[PDB]
Design a protein around this ligand. Structure first.
Ligand SMILES: Nc1ncnc2c1ncn2[C@@H]1O[C@H](COP(=O)(O)OP(=O)(O)OP(=O)(O)O)[C@@H](O)[C@H]1O
Ligand SMILES: [Mg+2]
Lengths: 173, 458, 107, 83
């Protein structure tokens, strides 16, 4: 998957967007450049052997919205190195860098029932203590959880489910 | 549900929805023109791609074909319904008879029996063949391997062992044709039908004709039938027509599966792939498998990885030499390289053990003299060294034997030799009881009585 | 008019980019100014994207990236016939004796 | 604003006439030593005869994700990228 080759570009675009105070636009800009990449006929062209420049200028034409001389030049760089199919992974990494820089985390919370909201006030206040970041909740109701709740944040998990605790107990043959 | 996304030789990549990706070793199915093709799943790549081997010809496959996900491994008929019929790797009937009256089907991928289940046995099994049960005798429930190069006698020897063992034995038998000649499958089938012994034998054939994927899996189809008869509590004979072809079909696909080459270009998994097959061919406290395997030796190189790995798996090993076979001594067994776990004074007893070690000592000493003799000639030897040579040459000739299956070649009638006659015979030669007979007297005579009658007419 | 540009030089192996609608066929001969002498290149492979890959028929030293490349549309062509007799030539059919030009009729 | 962007793209591709090859048809991408790499041929099948310009064939040996690998049944040296 493209993640490893997308990292160098994602940093440079975010760094540049910080200097020029344009991070929001750049996000909405990369969101278009990723989406044109997903179109079928455009995809065929990208898998083709068109020389970089001829590929780039035919891409840039479709990406009309792109800020000329900044967003459009970022395409020319990626076209020299044939990374254009990585654009969906150059985005999202840009969003990750942004969320780190804005000291903000999406955190997820999965339970047998819709949580009581008052509980979510406690959970968010706890997560803002566990991690020194503002925490957006987007919790879920799930049938698999017999009772209780899972808290998931980045790649750290705190299982509070009865499902997990039974299958944690069933372990001791 | 799936889509084909690459086709590289025998290997096909299929994409599935990420909620639905097939397990490893699942069977998939795809329509290829006017026939159905099965694919077996080997690896899960990322992103719902899955990499598979075609159980049939992959020519005419397009990209973008729709693939059906069967929820199970390759499963084959087992039990008495298979007896007397010829079946394919997929467990399909290949004789022109009707469908197989299966009651049960078993997945060809299985775990070996646990360490607690295994059983020991020391019951010596007799053979017709002077050199084999003298030099490398073997037990009921053990494994035998015939190692040799191209054209040395692996099949003819296995056909005598079938004739001798599998007709004085009373239980069922399984013969697995793995990457060998189709003519020899047809020749075998008939003489089984002409002898009316066919109804005790299940036959599975995956000959060289077939595409890689067939030659790879067909050995496991054969074991899975033999494991049903063993677990039923029977004593079973399993014959494998060439085990080397299983490893070679792994080599052919391994690069297309994206695995770095090892050693002499073999797959890196060679020892695990061989071991996971070999560990299933074991006798157990519930029931027994006696096994004979032919083992082709590429370029006669016994130090090649594929022979070298096979040697640790087996209880008796008989090694066939092109250098002997070009003398026309048959069976072309090398007694200085052939060996068995059963050549032990406790199981064989002392007379047999002493006779075998005497023969081994004289023939070794003859190898030590041959480099002197080649430059100097024999006249320079000592008068005891000349007696060692004069005996060793008689020993080499007396290891020769007429075979009932070989009558079509030599014309001469075959011989079955009791173990007692072999020990008595070789013990007499080494003691010098026969030092007055010519060498020609010993070549291709069944028993030592027959050497002295041949000597009267020279 | 030269239409290619050199894009790599790794010893004797020289890569040249052409416009996509103009790529040399295999074994076609190119030439370039290696300073003050013309150097011939023979085409070995067409790679993707208008890039072609060539072996230099002479010393590779002193080539820059970005030099212009003339695509002679034939293979290497050599003089033939009676005019060649008693003359020494190199692989390009150029006289290696000092004895002036070869009075060729055909190449 | 997603369904809009997708629609806009579809309109803009046409406005610029960028479009696929036909099935059963493709272009030579690279040429070396009698091996040929082809882009397109979304309906080619393993072991098919691919007709080249002139009156000659290549045999499809590999159907890669992005290309077909083929070997030329004759002289190859006149073939060129983009045929
Ligand atoms: N005991 C024997 N008596 C006479 N001839 C023999 C004997 N054993 C082998 N031969 C000769 O060698 C030939 C080949 O033997 P066989 O087919 O068993 O070889 P193989 O080891 O199976 O070779 P391959 O690896 O090709 O299958 C026989 O056809 C016969 O000509
Ligand atoms: Mg054989």
């Amino acid at each position: 998957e493209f993640i490893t080759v997308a990292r160098p570009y994602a940093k440079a675009a975010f760094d540049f967007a910080v200097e020029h105070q344009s991070v929001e636009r750049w996000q909405d800009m990369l969101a278009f450049a990723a989406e044109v990449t997903k179109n079928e006929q455009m995809a065929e062209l990208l898998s083709g052997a068109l020389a970089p420049e001829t590929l780039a200028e035919s891409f840039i034409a479709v990406a009309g919205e792109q800020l000329d001389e900044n967003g459009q030049n970022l395409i020319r760089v990626m076209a020299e190195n044939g990374r254009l199919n990585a654009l969906p992974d150059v985005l999202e990494q840009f969003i990750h860098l942004r969320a780190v820089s804005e000291a903000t985390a999406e955190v997820d919370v999965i339970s047998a029932a819709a949580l009581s909201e008052q509980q979510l006030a406690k959970i968010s206040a706890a997560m803002e203590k566990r991690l020194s970041r503002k925490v957006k909740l987007n919790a879920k109701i799930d049938k698999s959880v017999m009772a209780g709740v899972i808290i998931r944040a980045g790649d750290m998990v705190i299982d509070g489910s009865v499902r997990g605790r039974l299958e944690r107990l069933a372990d001791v043959l | 549900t799936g889509k084909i996304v690459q086709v590289i030789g025998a290997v096909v990549d299929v994409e599935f929805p990420q909620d639905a990706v097939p397990r490893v070793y699942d069977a998939l199915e795809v329509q290829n023109g006017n026939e159905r093709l099965v694919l077996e799943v080997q690896q899960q790549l990322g992103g719902g791609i899955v990499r598979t081997i075609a159980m049939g010809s992959s020519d005419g496959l397009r990209r973008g074909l729709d693939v059906k996900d069967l929820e199970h491994p390759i499963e084959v008929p087992v039990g008495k319904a298979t007896l007397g019929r010829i079946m394919n790797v997929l467990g399909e009937p290949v004789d022109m008879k009707g469908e197989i009256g299966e009651e049960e089907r078993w997945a060809i991928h299985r775990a070996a029996p646990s360490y607690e289940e295994l059983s020991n046995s020391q019951e010596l099994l007799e053979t017709g063949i002077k050199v084999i049960d003298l030099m490398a005798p073997f037990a009921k429930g053990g494994k035998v391997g015939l190692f040799g190069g191209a054209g040395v006698g692996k099949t003819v020897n296995m056909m005598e062992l079938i004739r001798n063992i599998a007709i004085e034995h009373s239980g069922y038998s399984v013969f697995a044709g793995v990457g060998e000649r189709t003519r020899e499958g047809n020749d075998f089938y008939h003489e089984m039908t002409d002898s009316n012994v066919i109804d005790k034998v299940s036959l599975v054939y995956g000959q060289m004709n077939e595409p890689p994927g067939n030659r790879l899996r067909v050995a496991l189809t054969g074991l899975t039938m033999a494991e049903k008869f063993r677990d039923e509590g029977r004593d079973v004979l399993l014959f494998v027509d060439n085990i080397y072809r299983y490893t070679l079909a792994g080599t052919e696909v391994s690069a297309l599966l994206g695995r770095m080459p090892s050693a002499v270009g073999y797959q890196p998994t060679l020892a695990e792939e061989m071991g996971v097959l070999q560990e299933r061919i074991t006798s157990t406290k519930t029931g027994s498998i006696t096994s004979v395997q032919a083992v082709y030796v590429p370029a006669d190189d016994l130090t090649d990885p594929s022979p070298a790995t096979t040697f640790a798996h087996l209880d008796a090993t008989v090694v066939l030499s092109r250098q002997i076979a070009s003398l026309g001594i048959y069976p072309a067994v090398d007694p200085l390289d052939s060996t068995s776990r059963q050549l032990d004074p406790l199981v064989v007893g002392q007379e047999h053990y002493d006779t075998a070690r005497g023969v081994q000592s004289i023939l070794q000493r003859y190898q030590e003299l041959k480099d002197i003799i080649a430059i100097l000639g024999m006249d320079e030897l000592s008068e005891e060294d000349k007696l060692v040579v004069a005996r060793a040459r008689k020993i080499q000739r007396f290891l020769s034997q007429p075979f009932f299956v070989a009558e079509v070649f030599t014309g001469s009638p075959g011989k079955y030799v009791s173990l007692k006659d072999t020990i008595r015979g070789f013990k007499g030669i080494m003691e010098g009881e026969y030092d007055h007979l010519p060498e020609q007297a010993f070549y291709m005579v069944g028993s030592i009585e027959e050497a002295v009658e041949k000597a009267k007419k020279l | 008019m030269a239409t290619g540009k050199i894009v790599q030089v790794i010893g004797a192996v020289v890569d040249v980019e052409f416009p996509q609608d103009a790529v040399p066929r295999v074994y076609d001969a190119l030439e370039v100014q290696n300073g003050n002498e013309r150097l011939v290149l023979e085409v070995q492979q067409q790679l993707g994207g208008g890039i072609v890959r060539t072996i230099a028929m002479g010393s590779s030293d002193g080539l820059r990236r970005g030099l212009d490349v003339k695509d002679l549309e034939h293979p290497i062509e050599v003089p033939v016939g009676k005019a060649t007799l008693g003359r020494i030539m190199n692989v390009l059919g150029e006289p290696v004796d000092m004895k002036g030009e070869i009075g060729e009729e055909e190449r | 604003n997603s369904t809009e962007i997708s629609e806009l793209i579809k309109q803009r591709i046409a406005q610029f006439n960028v479009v696929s090859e036909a099935h059963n048809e493709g272009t030579i991408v690279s040429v070396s030593d009698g091996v040929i790499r082809i882009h397109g041929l979304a309906d080619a099948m393993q072991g098919e005869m691919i007709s080249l310009p002139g009156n000659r064939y290549a045999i499809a040996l590999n159907l890669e994700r992005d290309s077909v690998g083929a070997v030329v049944m004759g002289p190859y040296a006149d073939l060129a990228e983009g045929m």
